[PDB]
Structure formats: C-alpha cells, structure tokens
A paper describes a structure:
The mitochondrial ATP synthase is a membrane protein complex that generates most of the ATP in eukaryotic cells. The translocation of protons through the membrane-bound Fo part, mediated by subunit a, drives the rotation of a membrane-embedded c-ring and the attached central stalk, which together form the rotor. The torque of the rotor against the stator subunits induces conformational changes in the (αβ)3 headpiece, thereby triggering catalysis. To reveal how the mitochondrial ATP synthase is modulated by lipids and organised into a dimer shaping discoid cristae in Euglenozoan mitochondria, we determined the structure of the ATP synthase dimer from E. gracilis.
The membrane-bound Fo region is composed of 22 proteins, of which 13 have no homologs in animals and fungi. The well-resolved membrane region allowed the identification of 37 native lipids, leading to the assignment of 25 cardiolipins, whereas the 12 remaining phophoslipids could not be unambiguously identified and were modelled as phosphatidic acid. Importantly, cardiolipin binding sites are found at the rotor-stator interface, dimer interface, and in a peripheral Fo cavity. Our cryo-EM map allowed tracing of subunit a, for which we identified six structurally conserved membrane-embedded helices (H1a to H6a) directly from side-chain densities. By contrast, in the E. gracilis structure, the N-terminal part of H5a is kinked towards the lumen, and therefore does not interact with the c-ring, and instead extends towards the lumenal membrane surface. This structural rearrangement results in a smaller interface between subunits a and c, with only three c-subunits forming interactions, which also has implications for the formation of the matrix half-channel. Adjacent to the proton-half channels, the E. gracilis ATP synthase structure reveals two bound cardiolipins (CDL1, CDL2) flanking either side of the two horizontal helices H5a and H6a. Near the matrix half-channel, CDL2 is coordinated collectively by R160 of H5a, R50 of ATPEG6 and R22 of subunit k. Together, these two bound cardiolipins enclose the two horizontal membrane helices H5a and H6a, possibly acting to seal the Fo against proton leakage by recruiting a high density of acyl chains, as well as separating lipid and aqueous environments in the vicinity of the two half-channels.
Numbering used by the authors:
A (entry chain N): 2 to 69
B (entry chain k), F (entry chain M): 58 to 113
C (entry chain g): 2 to 56
D (entry chain s): 10 to 74
E (entry chain j): 2 to 104
G (entry chain i): 2 to 98
H (entry chain f): 1 to 220
I (entry chain p): 7 to 120
The structure:
Amino acid sequence: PLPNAVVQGYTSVRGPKRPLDHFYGRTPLNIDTLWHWVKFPHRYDNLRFAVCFWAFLVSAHFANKKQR
Amino acid sequence: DMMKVMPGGKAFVGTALGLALFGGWGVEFVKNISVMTKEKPPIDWNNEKLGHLTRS
Amino acid sequence: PSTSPADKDVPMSILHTHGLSYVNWCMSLAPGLLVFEGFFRARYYRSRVPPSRTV
Amino acid sequence: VPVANFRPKKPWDGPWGIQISQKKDRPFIAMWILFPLLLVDHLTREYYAYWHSSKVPVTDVFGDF
Amino acid sequence: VYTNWQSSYTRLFVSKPWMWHPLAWMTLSVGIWWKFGKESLCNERSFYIHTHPKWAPHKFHTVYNWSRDPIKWTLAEQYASIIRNTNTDIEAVLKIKLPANAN
Amino acid sequence: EFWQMYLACWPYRFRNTVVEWETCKAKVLKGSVDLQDIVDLLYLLAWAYLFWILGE
Amino acid sequence: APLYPVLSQASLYKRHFFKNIKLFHVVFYVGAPCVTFGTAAWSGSNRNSREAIFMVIEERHGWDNFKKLSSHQQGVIMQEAAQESLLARNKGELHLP
Amino acid sequence: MLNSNIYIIIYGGIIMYSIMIIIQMFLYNFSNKIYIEVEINKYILSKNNIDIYWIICNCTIIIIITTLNHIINKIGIYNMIEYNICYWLIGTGLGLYISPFIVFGYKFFVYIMDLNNYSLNIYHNNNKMNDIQQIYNGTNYNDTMIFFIKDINNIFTIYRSINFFMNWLYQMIYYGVRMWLVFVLHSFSLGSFGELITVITDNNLIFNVFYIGLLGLGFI
Amino acid sequence: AAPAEKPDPALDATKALPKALEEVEFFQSYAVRRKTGFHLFNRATGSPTIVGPMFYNLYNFVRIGRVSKYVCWLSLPLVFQRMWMKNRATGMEYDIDLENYAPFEAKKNPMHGH
Amino acid sequence: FVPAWLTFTSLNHWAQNRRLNRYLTQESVFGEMARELVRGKTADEATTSVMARVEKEILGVH
Amino acid sequence: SPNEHLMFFDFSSWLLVDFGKRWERWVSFKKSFLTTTRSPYWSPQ
Amino acid sequence: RLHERRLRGDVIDEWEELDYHPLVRDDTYLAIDFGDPTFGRYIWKLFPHTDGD
Amino acid sequence: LIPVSLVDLININIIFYILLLYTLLLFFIPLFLASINYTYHYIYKYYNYNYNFINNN
Ligand SMILES: CCCCCCCCCCCCCCCC(=O)OC[C@H](COP(=O)(O)O)OC(=O)CCCCCCCCCCCCCCC
Ligand SMILES: CCCCCCCCCCCCO[C@@H]1O[C@H](CO)[C@@H](O[C@H]2O[C@H](CO)[C@@H](O)[C@H](O)[C@H]2O)[C@H](O)[C@H]1O
Ligand SMILES: CCCCCCCCCCCCO[C@@H]1O[C@H](CO)[C@@H](O[C@H]2O[C@H](CO)[C@@H](O)[C@H](O)[C@H]2O)[C@H](O)[C@H]1O
Ligand SMILES: CCCCCCCCCCCCO[C@@H]1O[C@H](CO)[C@@H](O[C@H]2O[C@H](CO)[C@@H](O)[C@H](O)[C@H]2O)[C@H](O)[C@H]1O
Ligand SMILES: COCCOCCOCCOc1ccc(C(C)(C)CC(C)(C)C)cc1
Ligand SMILES: COCCOCCOCCOc1ccc(C(C)(C)CC(C)(C)C)cc1
Ligand SMILES: COCCOCCOCCOc1ccc(C(C)(C)CC(C)(C)C)cc1
Ligand SMILES: COCCOCCOCCOc1ccc(C(C)(C)CC(C)(C)C)cc1
C-alpha cells in the first residue's frame, strides 16, 4: 500500500534526530508536566461550601424580593 | 507563414498576431453559428435625434 | 452604514435544546478522542525506555 | 598572523543561531494564545439571521454609505 | 553568511517557483470570482437568488421568509442613508418622460 | 462507611470554614497570594456563580 | 567569550515548554472542548434549536408580541416550540429534507 | 444615485480558522514529505523537481490538515469545508492543476506555441523536402488556401496545441467532484441511518438504551 | 532510455503491514486484565459478545488521557435532555387553530415559498 | 524600445488630445460635459449641470 | 438533521461595497498622483 | 568549548550549537536557502563505502 | 441538499479563506525551511584528503 520509505521515515539514509533537552537540576516543563505546579483545588473547599450556601441564599433573597 | 517557424519567439508572435487579427473574428463566427438559425427581432436603428443640445 | 440590529439578540438557555441521540453522540467522535488521546500518549511516552537493573 | 578563512561577523551575515531559534518558536508561542481565541470566537458567537429577522448585520467597509 | 532566507524575502520569492504558486492561485481565484461570481451573486440586481431553495438551499438557515424580506429592508435602509448623504429628491425621478427610438 | 465518614466530616468542615476564610483574608490583605490560591479561588467563584443562578 | 546574545537557562527552560509540543498534545486537547462545545454537540444543538424555536414563534405568536411578554412565558413558549420542532409531526418524525 | 453600483458580499468566520491551518503545519512538519519525494522521483527527473515537490507537499498537507480538522476540530467552517465544491475545485484542484505550469511553464509555453505551427512529426527525419516544406510553406501539410479560413484556424490550432494538456483539467475536476460527492453522500447516508434508528428507538423506549455501548459504537 | 537502475528496497512494500500490526498489538496489549473483578455478560447462547470484551482496552486508554476523560462526558447529559424532551413532545397538547394556521415544516405553505 | 515607446505614447496622447478638441466643438451632451470639465469644474457638479439640461430639453421633464 | 450538518451558518455580516464610488475614488487618486508628481505622458506611471 | 558547557549541564540550542561549527553552519544555511531538505544519496556518492548503508 | 448549490461554487468566503491561508503560508515559508540536516557534518568529519607525503628516496 505504502512504500517502505514512508514507513521508516527516510528514502535512503536515516538522519540523526537531536535528542530532547533535560534542564538538569529542575523539573521538566511540558504541557503534561503542569500538575507539579497546579494541583486540584484543596485549600478552600470548606470555604467553597460556605460561599455556595451564602450565594444560593442571597440570590434567592434578592430574586424573591424582585419578583414580589 | 515562414516567419511563424523562425526562432526568437516568432512562433508566439505569429500565433498572437493571428489571434489579434483574425482569431477574434473566428470567435465571433463560432458564436454566430447558433445565431443564424434563430428568430431575431428587427434592428432598432437609432433615429439619430437624441443627443443634440445647444451649447451655453 | 454599519449596523447591529436587535433581531440577532435573542434569549438563550440550554434548557430549550433538543439535544442529541445516542447515535449522534457516537457520531460526534468524542468516544474516539477519549481512547486515542491515551493511545498516542502511551505510545509516545512508552517508546522512550529508561535505564534499569534486571532482577 | 591570524588563521585563514576566518573573519568578524557583518550585518549581511544575518542573525545568529539563537536569534533564529527565537524566530522559530514564535508560532509555537502564539499557538497557545490563538487556539483559545479560536474556541472563544466560536463559542461567543451568535447567528446573524432568523426567520423573524427584518434586518441583517451590515458592515460598510469604506464608509461609502 | 548571506542568505535570502534571512536577509531578503524578495530574492527568495524570485528564486522559488513554489513560492509563486500560492500567489498565482490567489490571483486566479480572485479573477474567477470577478468574472463569474461577482455580478451573478454579489450584485444588488442578482442577490435575490440567495432566496432560491434550489440554487441556494438554506442560505438563511431556513427557507427564505418573504413576508419579512430582510434583504429588502436592509438594502432600503442603506439606500436611504445614501439619499440622505446625497440630499437627492425622491420625487425627481417621477417627473421624467423618456422618449422612444422611433422608426 | 461513606455515610459514617460523611457525618463525621461535618464538624471538620464547619470548623475549617472559618479557618479558610481567615487565611484567605490574610493572604488577600498581605498580598501573599500564589498560583494555587488563585486557581482555588477561581473554582470557588465558578461554583458560587452556579449556585447564584440556582438561587435565582 | 561568546559574541552573541547568550540566552539564560531559564529562558530556554520556558521556551522548551512552548516548542516541545507534539501533534496529539494539540489535536486531542483542543478537540475535546471543540467536539463537546462545537457545532456537533452543544453549540450546534443550541444554535440550531433556536432557529426552529423562533420560526415557530414568529409563525404562531409573533416576534414583537414575544418580545413584549415576560422571560418566563418567553421560555415557556420557547420550550413548546422546541418540542414541536423536535417532534416534527409533519415530517413523519424525521429531521430530513 | 445613478453612479452608485452596489455589491453585497456575505462575510463570516475565516481569519481565525485559516490561521490555525497554517500554525498546525509546524506540528505536522510535512510528514508527507517522503511519500511525495518518492513519487516525484518516480515520475520525473529534472533540476526543477524540488519546486514541484514543495508545491505538492504544501497542497497535500493542507488537505490532510483540513481533513483532520474536518474530522476532529469541528467548528464553523471546518465542518463544511470538505462538503463544499468550491474548496474541492479551487481550494485543492486549482493549485495541483497550475503546479506544473508554474514549474515547467517555460517549456510548456514554448511547446504550445510551436504546436500552433502544426506539422507531422517524423522519427529519424533525415529528409530534405521536409525542411523546405516546414520553412517555405510553414508545415509539412498542404497549407494552400487555408488563410481563407484563418479566423477559425488560429483558434482551432490553439486548441490543437493544448488538447494534450486538457485531460489534466478533466481529471482534476473529476476527482474534486468525486471527493465532494463522497464526503457529502456518505455523511448524509450515515446520518440518515442514524436518524431512522433514533426514530425506531424513540417510539420504543425498551430499545432507547445504549444498546451497543457508549464507547463501542463510537469507537467503531 | 535504458538507465539500468538497481532495485531500491525503500520503494518496496514489506514494512507497512508489519508496522500497522505492531500498532494494533500495542493497542491490544492494554486489553490484558486480571481475573479478579472480571465479569462479562455473554449472549443467551453463552457465546461472548463483540463489543463486550473490547471495552477494557478502551477504558484503560481513557485512563491514560488527561483532558478528554474529563471533558468528552459533558456532551452526554444532552442525550438525556433529548430523551426527556422527545417524550414530552410525543403527547403535547396544542391548539388546533395555530397548528392549522402555522404548521411547522408542513408542505405547500405559500408563506414559506412552496 | 525608446523610439517605439515614445512613438506609441505620443501618438496615443495626441489622439486623446484630438478627441477632446473634437468633443469640445461638438454641439451635443458630451460636448457640453467636456466643456464644463475643461473650465475646471468637478465631475459631480458637471454631471448635475448637464443632467439639469438633459431632463428639460432632451427628456421633456413633466 | 444531516443536512443541518452540511450547512455553513457561521456568517458574520454583509459587506456592502459601492464599486462605482470605489472606482471613482481610484480614478481620483490616479489623477492626483499624476498631477502631484507632474509626470509626463511617456512615463510608465 | 561548547562541550564544556554541555558537561556542566547547560542546554544548548540547536542553532547556538551550530555556530560553534562555523564551516558546517554556512553550508547548512545555504542548503536551507536553496530549499531542498532531502539527504542521503549525496553521502552515498561522495563516500561509496556507505552505499546501501 | 444544501452543499448542492451554485452559490457555493464560487463562494467568495472560501476564496477569502484560501487567500488568507496562502498569504500566511508565504509569510511562514522561511520558518518551514528552518530544519537542519546533518549531511555537512558527515562531510566535514569523513572527508579526509590524502595526508601522505612524497619521498623519492
Ligand atoms: C437541562 C440542561 C442540560 C443538563 C444539565 C446542565 C448540564 C450539566 C453538565 C455539565 C455542564 C455542561 C456545560 C454546558 C455549557 C454549554 O452549553 O456549552 C455551549 C456553550 C456555547 O453555547 P451558545 O453559544 O449557544 O451560548 O459554550 C460554553 O458553555 C463555554 C464552555 C467553555 C469550555 C472550555 C473548556 C476548556 C477545557 C480545557 C481544555 C484546554 C485545552 C486548550 C483549549 C483552549
Ligand atoms: C472502511 C469502511 C467502509 C464502509 C464505509 C462506510 C461509510 C463511512 C462514511 C464515513 C464518513 C461519514 O462522515 C461523517 O458523517 C457523520 C454523519 O453525518 C458526521 O457526523 C456529524 O453529523 C451528524 C449528522 O446528524 C450528527 O448527528 C453528528 O453528531 C455529527 O458528528 C461526521 O462528522 C462525518 O465525519
Ligand atoms: C489500506 C488500504 C490502502 C490505503 C493505503 C494507504 C493508507 C494511508 C493512510 C494511513 C497513513 C498513515 O500515515 C503515517 O503518517 C505518519 C506520520 O506520523 C508517517 O510517519 C513517518 O513520518 C514521521 C515524521 O513525520 C517519521 O518520524 C516516522 O518515522 C515515519 O513513520 C508514517 O510513515 C505513515 O504511515
Ligand atoms: C481581496 C480580494 C479582492 C481583491 C479585488 C481586487 C480586484 C482588482 C481588479 C480590479 C479590476 C478593475 O476593473 C474595473 O472594474 C470596474 C469596476 O470596479 C469597471 O468599472 C465599470 O463599472 C463601474 C461600476 O460598477 C462603473 O462606474 C464604471 O464606469 C465601469 O467602467 C471597469 O470597467 C473595470 O476596468
Ligand atoms: C458571591 O458571588 C458569587 C458570584 O456572583 C456573581 C453574580 O453574577 C450575576 C449574574 O447575573 C445573571 C443573572 C441571570 C442570568 C440568567 C437568567 C440569564 C441565567 C440563566 C439563563 C442561566 C438562568 C445570568 C446572569
Ligand atoms: C485507523 O486509524 C485510526 C487512528 O487514527 C487516529 C487519528 O489521529 C489523528 C492524529 O493522531 C496522531 C497524533 C500524533 C501522531 C504522532 C505521535 C506520530 C505525531 C508526531 C510525528 C509529532 C510525533 C500521529 C497521529
Ligand atoms: C491495511 O493498511 C495498511 C497500511 O499501512 C499503513 C502503515 O502506516 C503506519 C503508520 O503508523 C505509524 C505511526 C507512527 C509510527 C512511529 C512509531 C515510527 C512514529 C515516531 C516517529 C513518532 C516514533 C509508526 C507507524
Ligand atoms: C492507529 O492504529 C491503531 C488502531 O488499532 C485499533 C484496533 O482496534 C481493535 C481493538 O479492539 C479489540 C479487539 C479485541 C480484543 C480482545 C477482545 C483482543 C480479545 C481477547 C482479550 C478476548 C483475547 C480487544 C480489543
């Protein structure tokens, strides 16, 4: 279906690929290495519960007053 | 006809010259083959009355 | 001149959406991305083996 | 005496290699800014005509109108 | 070391027909629209074909609403703006009596 | 097990509401607000906007 | 004694984040939000149900009168229109031409 | 006013959708380069190979990119662009059509303008009268009193020079129309079968269930 | 004319099918599963299904994703939205006058054009 | 090319000059428009000035 | 609908161009360019 | 001198490293200007002991 | 069908698409050409002129 050149990636000679840099002494920085810096929110979860309650309540209050 | 086959772009010159001179009339002729048989109205010849206007 | 009529400004709400079928959702090709993202990630990050010690 | 086939750089020698690298990775940087902009351009869009629309958005390009 | 790659885009373009190809493509497409698509579709005299269900199916996401006629009122607003910018008399056209090419 | 831990976790949540609020106030006044704090606050504001719509 | 504008280690560390992308890292990561919130699933469903809704409304009630009503009754009539269109009682319950 | 000739163009989402087609070319990085290398070296040997090669590569990769954007990145134009005939004729076919005329246009033009001087081609033309006929009369054939119809002859001869460049245009149009029909008809047929299945299952909610599977049908 | 070129192995086709089978084998390697927690409803005959024993592979790959496994499900509630609205519409009571005056997508309506 | 270029350009220039001179002495609508333009007037003003005469004398305005 | 998927309704507006006015202004620019430069008739301009 | 930096753990750009091979940097830049990214048969003709390798 | 239309045959919108696409292509050609081959490295390393000297005796 396809010639061997397309599969192996070269017609005659296999060219050397420059390897990937590492940046010794620190973590890799890639699109997939970002969870090292940004975990899921874990610090303000209970504050999230409180603020969700208060937001619901205040919205309901002002909406009911407006409607009435 | 003997300049057409000469070198130095004379083939292009001959072709373009034949086009510009007679090939346009040939295009018109080909367009007119399907016009000769068709019912066409009388030609509304210009009365040559409209356009005259005194200067001022 | 340039215009910006109010006919284009209309109400919007996700509640009024008809939606999709199970078949149309399968045709949306999300289930394909779901698998092949992991497939290609696995192929790329598993091609490059690190050094080791055989136990 | 100096070594032959060597000289100082000149303006017509072009930029250095690190500068060419900085030129190369500009599309890769603008990718991160443009793909979200593409998604925002699609998501924050509104159709321009409806069955009820008496008008359609017009854009006079040269202000002739 | 001098290269048109890094020092002259013009000489690079001149030295590579595969750089001329997209430009010729663009010019040809625009010429095609100018010759064929311009007057038949985009002109005001030829813009109602977009209301056709056979040649322009669902150009407005639906069948064209003729009771509403968005084209008519859009273009009428624009012509009115032209008239106000030009200060032309609406009723001056009705005072005309064209002759006939008699005989 | 989940029911028992859900019950037992309510005192922790009600106790740490005030703690998290005070730490957020201190970080906002002091300005010592970092990336993870910003992400948590954005998640917070998203859920708060949802619950605002819900309360409406 | 490098004569060129030597680039710091951290600047290269940051540029590597941008130039070390692979094709799948773009394709799937941008296709998931796109396929979900695109012309297929969400944005398409919304924006194409709106057309049928307002066609039904302007045919049955009118756009001006609809504009005069409340947001609640607006939504009620919109939902009724969405149901009428999804049903497609005249097309034999088939969304085809 | 009289002098005001007004034209209406319909403008939509073009800029941001065309930018990313080009930005993706850095990611693909011409993965099709080896295939077109192989094929071009199969089909021609000249100094101007690389030129035509580059052209095809660009054209081809754009097609590939659009196809994947048509399959995966479904927004706005990327869905219609493969279902539109203008893209398949002018957006894919015209470039491939004009590529050899842009690379080998000198030779083809010289050939075409020489073929207007229509003549019979002789192999091992060691004849002497052939030369006199070609120079004096212009052609091997008898051109006596053909000037009498020169008006048509010119234009006809022009076609006689390009008739062997015309099947390329025909094949380009044919395969553009083929791709358009394939995409459109297969999408329509698949969607139609899906809608019929949904009609069968919506009226029978015992079957309105993920009966093949959430990922199985989608993966297939 | 008579160049006498030797055969180029790169122009042969002896690697494409092996490479595709290598990719498919890498895919199927992730279908290996432990005996614990295994259950698959077979057909009524007792024979296995087609899609059944090839769900573990797909979901083992979903496990490895990063963004699609948390996003591509958000279009699924829309399916249930349709399931509910369709049943709402199957028996919706409507005014006869509006249906006769403004039928939706009915043929021969001159206000549409035909 | 230089003599040919000068010949072509100058012959066409003098042809256009002759054309304008012939139009100016022509007792017609186009002659009037050409005259009004040679005075130093604007295109729009001259069109209006000539059409005001066309509507009256030629078309016979209501 | 399937046909609904074969539709491009991502339009934004209608660009209105008075080609007569644009041609008039182009000709005016040409005249202004030729007068300001004081260019002769034998010039390529 | 560049390898001294590489041994210290410093990352060198692909083009920064080429500048430390100036004679190859020039021929590589000209090959880019010409626009022929192919390679392999030139090595097999100049060094026929590599033919087929 | 919708795509079966003469309006979509010479659609100026797709022509704008093609125009912007290939103008951007032209703008970015000098970055597509910026891939390095390692052939002149090979030539520098492996090209070895004959270093033997002449000795008549
Ligand atoms: C009854 C209603 C339906 C059922 C109940 C509600 C749905 C509950 C399911 C969860 C919520 C679904 C939200 C639906 C919103 C919607 O309708 O979606 C459609 C809308 C557009 O619809 P309209 O244009 O018609 O208004 O789009 C949005 O909501 C914007 C969402 C932004 C998503 C960004 C995700 C980024 C992920 C990170 C990827 C990083 C990679 C790089 C890319 C930049
Ligand atoms: C080797 C296989 C040989 C057998 C060939 C069988 C024919 C296969 C044709 C594949 C091409 C069909 O092309 C595909 O069509 C479907 C169905 O409209 C489109 O699907 C899209 O439109 C449909 C129409 O309702 C929506 O419901 C769906 O949500 C959306 O994804 C895809 O976006 C397109 O990619
Ligand atoms: C089967 C019926 C007949 C039809 C046959 C043709 C089907 C073609 C469609 C499948 C195409 C697969 O296309 C595949 O693309 C990848 C790109 O990642 C190519 O990959 C190639 O290029 C990359 C870089 O770009 C090289 O690093 C790699 O070594 C090489 O394999 C594959 O060689 C090719 O096989
Ligand atoms: C970015 C994509 C679009 C790029 C478009 C650029 C196109 C450039 C080519 C312009 C072609 C010039 O072609 C010129 O067009 C104008 C209209 O404009 C024609 O002009 C004709 O129509 C206009 C109005 O419609 C009349 O006012 C005028 O008296 C008449 O001659 C000219 O007879 C023709 O010579
Ligand atoms: C504590 O604060 C938390 C966030 O509060 C932000 C409040 O934002 C105000 C939002 O205002 C509205 C109000 C109504 C709506 C509608 C009715 C349009 C939403 C809808 C259609 C989803 C019901 C949208 C936004
Ligand atoms: C029958 O085949 C079905 C599989 O097709 C899935 C289509 O995927 C779209 C593109 O997916 C990719 C993603 C990345 C790649 C690689 C990893 C080769 C990219 C590369 C060359 C940058 C490393 C190849 C294909
Ligand atoms: C019946 O169909 C047979 C057609 O065969 C097609 C063969 O193409 C296989 C393409 O799939 C790939 C993809 C990537 C790769 C590799 C692993 C070489 C990619 C790389 C360069 C990123 C490591 C190899 C093969
Ligand atoms: C890019 O190319 C990769 C595309 O490959 C896709 C292959 O899809 C088929 C995989 O589906 C299966 C089929 C069978 C099986 C298992 C059921 C092999 C059979 C078993 C586990 C009973 C031995 C698992 C997954």
